[PDB]
């Protein structure tokens, strides 16, 4: 229960937030992006993934 | 004591024997963590034998469930107590209120 | 028994005619003694402490 | 290629609480040092705190004093909160007396070169009978963080003074710490931040004193974070004791008479490894030891299995 | 004596040595499950949340 | 009446505030409720059960 | 009064670029405090040289097309941020991409300058299609004690200065003989290769320590 609210709130999106629309190399700098208060956890974004 | 209560706590505290309740209104002559002596007011006082109601407090002692049941004085030296006032709190009762 | 016998003899204990039955405190539980009572049979001589 | 901060106005506001400021702070280091200082300041700060207490005619916490309105248990609980400061000393034993129908404040104690009663209104208890009278040995150590009455018995080794009533020790002086980094514009430089660290004390630490020991520890820690030697311990301890291990125990263990007890104190014999190898020849020559006095030593040595006067070409090995 | 030496031992004897945990109504086979023990201060059992 | 009494305290009506994690020092997204709830210890104390 | 510094610390590193350090036993609460604080400095303020701006050869806009390349303009910016740059005496260098023909432009296919060191010549910059297909441009590296977005440049590439690609600290319980609960601190880091994980931290910490030079006694 706790844990699923967690993944959901994590992988969920809102309309407009910090980070809206930027582009990233891969998840590694996605976290670097968030931890440092630049991006909202849930913000619509194009990233390179493998 | 409950920050948030409903109002019975005062009712329960007294009616349950746990607390020590003033028999007759008067003033406190003596306060020891052990006992409480009340000099009765004249109005309530019987003519002969005069004096005072003396309440001896229960100190640290075993409960049925092995909890500890101990009375404490909640009034101060030379304070007015009216008939039916809280003279000392039991365990898990504060200032006349029920505090579980 | 034998080997028990030889042991009492090597370390010199006077193996008693009396067992140890003393009331001792229960494992793990620890506190302050706040009272002692002695209940004595009607007609037994009261000990020192009693 | 970097800057470095330092502390401007440390503004006291009460004996209990002050707001110290930190001005040369670069981007977000405001929160970097700010949280991490809250974390050292709320724990790792020294404090002296009342530890044990002997009281007059009182055996243990669960009793009542005759003519006082607190129950002993409570009275120890008033002392847990007895704020104090001492300087050169590391455990002082204050003393309290007073009689007469009178509220006994933390004042009514007796001063020492080192003792500062940072709050002498502090109520310790109340007397209630003209010639009701109390005395006590309040004992105050100084240490770090929370050392609860319970953990204090492992050394034991005879805390027999039954009238000694250990209280839990809340050794600290921080109450709550609360930083905020409001952006401070030093006249030129893009944006550097301020760090108003607000705090709340028991009175017994002076804010600047604190904040330094705080960085002190932060340093000492990181000190090994710099380099990283993969360091380890040698370990692999020894599985070979030579003699019987009894020879490493102290002579108290022999549960012997006082006169013979100090005799081996004085003739230099702590460990039974030395009492074993000292004959009767050695002992009449020893200060205050006769036929009654030594008959004593051959009976306990007899019952434990050992003897007087022997050898071991090897005593004692080897750490 | 609860000598301090033993704890370093117990960790050995503990290691690869599963224990069984079982809760009240044993209903499906999963009512008993085996875990690898990890030493704890406190008188409580710590039970992994997914189980 | 509850909110009205929250005014006089000078406290938000949300009953919620912003809080910060003591560890990372950073803020918690969303307001969380904080308040005072009278709470009991029942005597199913662990070291009686173990 | 007197404090606790750790013992036993096996930095068990996978590859040269990646590393996992375990380090016990810390005082209580000291895992997170040191862990988070070194994380902040490792992440946000760590001196590095990445790429900030690029002037193109063919077209004047970030929404245009180059003839001969399947990689979009936003795409190649991404490949750039992931190129690892380390400068020597030089505070800012700019390079020329001179290469053309039937296939991908690696970083050995870059101009080799004096105070320039490319940690990955293998690094794929872009692909080159058929025939000829022309490509040369000048790309200006910038210096900073951070990670600076394309957007933060108001008067264009996200500048990923700090060598740290990723940071985490995990705090778990460590037992010292007769102490119940101490912290055991596990730091796990990945780098852009320009500096090995082992040192990044030394200096990452060195920086933090430098700020306390105003307090210690």
UniProtKB/Swiss-Prot annotation, chain A:
It comes from Escherichia coli O139:H28 (strain E24377A / ETEC). Belongs to the RNA polymerase beta' chain family. The chain holds residues 504 to 553 of 1407 of the full protein. The RNAP catalytic core consists of 2 alpha, 1 beta, 1 beta' and 1 omega subunit. When a sigma factor is associated with the core the holoenzyme is formed, which can initiate transcription. This is DNA-directed RNA polymerase subunit beta'. Disulfide bonds: none annotated. It comes from the Bacteria. DNA-dependent RNA polymerase catalyzes the transcription of DNA into RNA using the four ribonucleoside triphosphates as substrates.
From Swiss-Prot, chain D:
GO terms for biological process: DNA-templated transcription. SUPFAM superfamilies: C-terminal domain of RNA polymerase alpha subunit, Insert subdomain of RNA polymerase alpha subunit, RBP11-like subunits of RNA polymerase. GO terms for molecular function: DNA binding; DNA-directed RNA polymerase activity; protein dimerization activity. Residues 1-229 are annotated as: Alpha N-terminal domain (alpha-NTD). GO terms for cellular component: cytoplasm; DNA-directed RNA polymerase complex. It is an enzyme of class 2 (transferase). The keyword Transferase applies. Keywords: DNA-directed RNA polymerase, Nucleotidyltransferase, Transcription, Transferase. DNA-dependent RNA polymerase catalyzes the transcription of DNA into RNA using the four ribonucleoside triphosphates as substrates. Belongs to the RNA polymerase alpha chain family. This is DNA-directed RNA polymerase subunit alpha. The lineage of its organism: Bacteria, Pseudomonadati, Pseudomonadota, Gammaproteobacteria, Enterobacterales.
Swiss-Prot record, chain E:
The chain holds residues 403 to 453 of 1407 of the full protein. It comes from Escherichia coli O139:H28 (strain E24377A / ETEC). It comes from the Bacteria. DNA-dependent RNA polymerase catalyzes the transcription of DNA into RNA using the four ribonucleoside triphosphates as substrates. This is DNA-directed RNA polymerase subunit beta'. The RNAP catalytic core consists of 2 alpha, 1 beta, 1 beta' and 1 omega subunit. When a sigma factor is associated with the core the holoenzyme is formed, which can initiate transcription. Belongs to the RNA polymerase beta' chain family.
Curated annotation (Swiss-Prot), chain F:
Belongs to the RNA polymerase beta chain family. Signal peptide: none annotated. DNA-dependent RNA polymerase catalyzes the transcription of DNA into RNA using the four ribonucleoside triphosphates as substrates. Coiled coil: none annotated. It comes from Escherichia coli O139:H28 (strain E24377A / ETEC). The modification N6-acetyllysine is found at residue 7. The RNAP catalytic core consists of 2 alpha, 1 beta, 1 beta' and 1 omega subunit. When a sigma factor is associated with the core the holoenzyme is formed, which can initiate transcription. The chain holds residues 1194 to 1243 of 1342 of the full protein. The lineage of its organism: Bacteria, Pseudomonadati, Pseudomonadota, Gammaproteobacteria, Enterobacterales. Transmembrane segments: none annotated. It comes from the Bacteria. This is DNA-directed RNA polymerase subunit beta.
